[PDB]
DNA sequence: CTGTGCTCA
């Protein structure tokens, strides 16, 4: 388990553009992104304004941000979402969930790059 | 130290 996590850690750092997420957010918001991505990231609203499940709200945007052809764990955390389960800081569950979203999202994105 | 999934069924 932990050995395979370190191998994916080097695969995720390889996919990093080296740029801060605040620039990637503008490169996506200027391209009229999908309705869910546009109203949550490209607008001042949040998951509370669309009443979407917080578990899915994080997962839907993490899939699309990584599908942009670039990935890095720090992008998801520096996006500073207001209702994400990765930032509740109430317990260690936020750290275990943060690895789950990046692990499963990259499995799908890598499958779409390896074709 | 303790869960959390995809678009389109």
PDB file of C-alpha atoms in Angstrom, chain A:
ATOM      1  CA  UNK A   1       0.000   0.000   0.000  1.00  0.00           C
ATOM      2  CA  UNK A   2       2.486   2.654   1.163  1.00  0.00           C
ATOM      3  CA  UNK A   3       5.077   1.550  -1.424  1.00  0.00           C
ATOM      4  CA  UNK A   4       2.594   2.064  -4.274  1.00  0.00           C
ATOM      5  CA  UNK A   5       1.669   5.455  -2.773  1.00  0.00           C
ATOM      6  CA  UNK A   6       5.266   6.694  -3.045  1.00  0.00           C
ATOM      7  CA  UNK A   7       5.396   5.582  -6.697  1.00  0.00           C
ATOM      8  CA  UNK A   8       2.220   7.571  -7.459  1.00  0.00           C
ATOM      9  CA  UNK A   9       3.645  10.492  -5.450  1.00  0.00           C
ATOM     10  CA  UNK A  10       6.469  10.723  -8.016  1.00  0.00           C
ATOM     11  CA  UNK A  11       3.962  10.352 -10.875  1.00  0.00           C
ATOM     12  CA  UNK A  12       1.839  13.222  -9.500  1.00  0.00           C
ATOM     13  CA  UNK A  13       4.894  15.469  -9.006  1.00  0.00           C
ATOM     14  CA  UNK A  14       5.963  14.665 -12.584  1.00  0.00           C
ATOM     15  CA  UNK A  15       2.583  15.980 -13.806  1.00  0.00           C
ATOM     16  CA  UNK A  16       3.045  19.311 -11.975  1.00  0.00           C
ATOM     17  CA  UNK A  17       3.445  22.420 -14.174  1.00  0.00           C
ATOM     18  CA  UNK A  18       5.410  24.094 -11.350  1.00  0.00           C
ATOM     19  CA  UNK A  19       2.938  27.018 -11.444  1.00  0.00           C
ATOM     20  CA  UNK A  20       0.616  28.112  -8.602  1.00  0.00           C
ATOM     21  CA  UNK A  21      -3.058  27.124  -8.961  1.00  0.00           C
ATOM     22  CA  UNK A  22      -4.172  30.779  -9.026  1.00  0.00           C
ATOM     23  CA  UNK A  23      -2.877  30.981 -12.626  1.00  0.00           C
ATOM     24  CA  UNK A  24      -4.387  27.649 -13.715  1.00  0.00           C
ATOM     25  CA  UNK A  25      -7.767  28.785 -12.347  1.00  0.00           C
ATOM     26  CA  UNK A  26      -7.704  31.765 -14.739  1.00  0.00           C
ATOM     27  CA  UNK A  27      -6.612  29.591 -17.690  1.00  0.00           C
ATOM     28  CA  UNK A  28      -9.710  27.436 -17.101  1.00  0.00           C
ATOM     29  CA  UNK A  29     -12.198  30.203 -16.196  1.00  0.00           C
ATOM     30  CA  UNK A  30     -11.387  32.079 -19.440  1.00  0.00           C
ATOM     31  CA  UNK A  31     -12.347  28.999 -21.520  1.00  0.00           C
ATOM     32  CA  UNK A  32     -16.029  28.874 -20.410  1.00  0.00           C
ATOM     33  CA  UNK A  33     -15.744  25.579 -18.454  1.00  0.00           C
ATOM     34  CA  UNK A  34     -18.646  23.155 -17.730  1.00  0.00           C
ATOM     35  CA  UNK A  35     -21.625  24.489 -15.745  1.00  0.00           C
ATOM     36  CA  UNK A  36     -20.554  22.886 -12.441  1.00  0.00           C
ATOM     37  CA  UNK A  37     -16.915  23.990 -12.771  1.00  0.00           C
ATOM     38  CA  UNK A  38     -17.902  27.476 -13.966  1.00  0.00           C
ATOM     39  CA  UNK A  39     -20.333  28.313 -11.165  1.00  0.00           C
ATOM     40  CA  UNK A  40     -18.109  26.936  -8.375  1.00  0.00           C
ATOM     41  CA  UNK A  41     -14.586  27.980  -9.473  1.00  0.00           C
ATOM     42  CA  UNK A  42     -15.071  30.591 -12.234  1.00  0.00           C
ATOM     43  CA  UNK A  43     -17.655  32.418 -10.057  1.00  0.00           C
ATOM     44  CA  UNK A  44     -17.856  33.624  -6.440  1.00  0.00           C
ATOM     45  CA  UNK A  45     -20.503  30.991  -5.545  1.00  0.00           C
ATOM     46  CA  UNK A  46     -19.818  27.671  -3.782  1.00  0.00           C
ATOM     47  CA  UNK A  47     -21.178  24.144  -3.216  1.00  0.00           C
ATOM     48  CA  UNK A  48     -23.615  25.667  -0.678  1.00  0.00           C
ATOM     49  CA  UNK A  49     -25.278  27.750  -3.429  1.00  0.00           C
ATOM     50  CA  UNK A  50     -25.979  24.683  -5.607  1.00  0.00           C
ATOM     51  CA  UNK A  51     -26.730  22.374  -2.635  1.00  0.00           C
ATOM     52  CA  UNK A  52     -24.446  19.605  -3.967  1.00  0.00           C
ATOM     53  CA  UNK A  53     -22.946  16.859  -1.778  1.00  0.00           C
ATOM     54  CA  UNK A  54     -19.559  18.042  -0.438  1.00  0.00           C
ATOM     55  CA  UNK A  55     -18.044  14.594  -1.055  1.00  0.00           C
ATOM     56  CA  UNK A  56     -19.050  14.816  -4.731  1.00  0.00           C
ATOM     57  CA  UNK A  57     -18.413  18.557  -5.087  1.00  0.00           C
ATOM     58  CA  UNK A  58     -14.728  18.020  -4.303  1.00  0.00           C
ATOM     59  CA  UNK A  59     -14.545  14.888  -6.463  1.00  0.00           C
ATOM     60  CA  UNK A  60     -16.168  16.535  -9.509  1.00  0.00           C
ATOM     61  CA  UNK A  61     -13.795  19.526  -9.526  1.00  0.00           C
ATOM     62  CA  UNK A  62     -10.706  17.429  -8.693  1.00  0.00           C
ATOM     63  CA  UNK A  63     -11.408  15.208 -11.720  1.00  0.00           C
ATOM     64  CA  UNK A  64     -11.720  18.198 -14.052  1.00  0.00           C
ATOM     65  CA  UNK A  65      -8.714  20.134 -12.698  1.00  0.00           C
ATOM     66  CA  UNK A  66      -6.530  17.031 -13.153  1.00  0.00           C
ATOM     67  CA  UNK A  67      -8.091  16.373 -16.585  1.00  0.00           C
ATOM     68  CA  UNK A  68      -6.656  19.773 -17.616  1.00  0.00           C
ATOM     69  CA  UNK A  69      -3.459  17.797 -18.380  1.00  0.00           C
ATOM     70  CA  UNK A  70      -1.706  18.823 -15.133  1.00  0.00           C
ATOM     71  CA  UNK A  71      -1.825  17.414 -11.587  1.00  0.00           C
ATOM     72  CA  UNK A  72      -0.420  18.264  -8.151  1.00  0.00           C
ATOM     73  CA  UNK A  73      -1.788  17.629  -4.610  1.00  0.00           C
ATOM     74  CA  UNK A  74      -0.967  21.235  -3.672  1.00  0.00           C
ATOM     75  CA  UNK A  75      -3.288  22.592  -6.396  1.00  0.00           C
ATOM     76  CA  UNK A  76      -6.334  20.959  -4.787  1.00  0.00           C
ATOM     77  CA  UNK A  77      -5.457  22.310  -1.335  1.00  0.00           C
ATOM     78  CA  UNK A  78      -4.377  25.798  -2.513  1.00  0.00           C
ATOM     79  CA  UNK A  79      -7.667  26.142  -4.424  1.00  0.00           C
ATOM     80  CA  UNK A  80      -8.998  27.156  -0.963  1.00  0.00           C
ATOM     81  CA  UNK A  81     -12.529  25.694  -1.353  1.00  0.00           C
ATOM     82  CA  UNK A  82     -14.864  26.724   1.492  1.00  0.00           C
ATOM     83  CA  UNK A  83     -16.775  23.459   2.099  1.00  0.00           C
ATOM     84  CA  UNK A  84     -14.308  20.732   1.052  1.00  0.00           C
ATOM     85  CA  UNK A  85     -13.949  17.701   3.343  1.00  0.00           C
ATOM     86  CA  UNK A  86     -10.157  17.983   2.905  1.00  0.00           C
ATOM     87  CA  UNK A  87     -10.101  21.263   4.898  1.00  0.00           C
ATOM     88  CA  UNK A  88     -12.537  20.634   7.785  1.00  0.00           C
ATOM     89  CA  UNK A  89      -9.463  19.994   9.984  1.00  0.00           C
ATOM     90  CA  UNK A  90     -11.875  18.477  12.551  1.00  0.00           C
ATOM     91  CA  UNK A  91     -10.087  15.095  12.477  1.00  0.00           C
ATOM     92  CA  UNK A  92      -7.548  12.962  10.576  1.00  0.00           C
ATOM     93  CA  UNK A  93     -10.309  11.825   8.177  1.00  0.00           C
ATOM     94  CA  UNK A  94      -9.557  14.879   6.008  1.00  0.00           C
ATOM     95  CA  UNK A  95      -6.012  13.620   5.365  1.00  0.00           C
ATOM     96  CA  UNK A  96      -7.101  10.073   4.455  1.00  0.00           C
ATOM     97  CA  UNK A  97      -9.816  11.424   2.144  1.00  0.00           C
ATOM     98  CA  UNK A  98      -7.381  13.825   0.469  1.00  0.00           C
ATOM     99  CA  UNK A  99      -5.230  10.864  -0.616  1.00  0.00           C
ATOM    100  CA  UNK A 100      -8.335   8.974  -1.819  1.00  0.00           C
ATOM    101  CA  UNK A 101      -9.462  11.748  -4.182  1.00  0.00           C
ATOM    102  CA  UNK A 102      -5.976  12.224  -5.651  1.00  0.00           C
ATOM    103  CA  UNK A 103      -5.430   8.457  -5.954  1.00  0.00           C
ATOM    104  CA  UNK A 104      -8.719   7.647  -7.702  1.00  0.00           C
ATOM    105  CA  UNK A 105      -8.841  10.826  -9.800  1.00  0.00           C
ATOM    106  CA  UNK A 106      -5.361  10.166 -11.197  1.00  0.00           C
ATOM    107  CA  UNK A 107      -6.318   6.552 -11.979  1.00  0.00           C
ATOM    108  CA  UNK A 108      -9.041   7.882 -14.307  1.00  0.00           C
ATOM    109  CA  UNK A 109      -6.953  10.742 -15.742  1.00  0.00           C
ATOM    110  CA  UNK A 110      -3.954   8.457 -16.385  1.00  0.00           C
ATOM    111  CA  UNK A 111      -6.280   5.978 -18.124  1.00  0.00           C
ATOM    112  CA  UNK A 112      -7.376   8.854 -20.385  1.00  0.00           C
ATOM    113  CA  UNK A 113      -3.754   9.881 -21.090  1.00  0.00           C
ATOM    114  CA  UNK A 114      -2.603   6.288 -21.741  1.00  0.00           C
ATOM    115  CA  UNK A 115      -4.472   5.573 -24.989  1.00  0.00           C
TER     116      UNK A 115
END
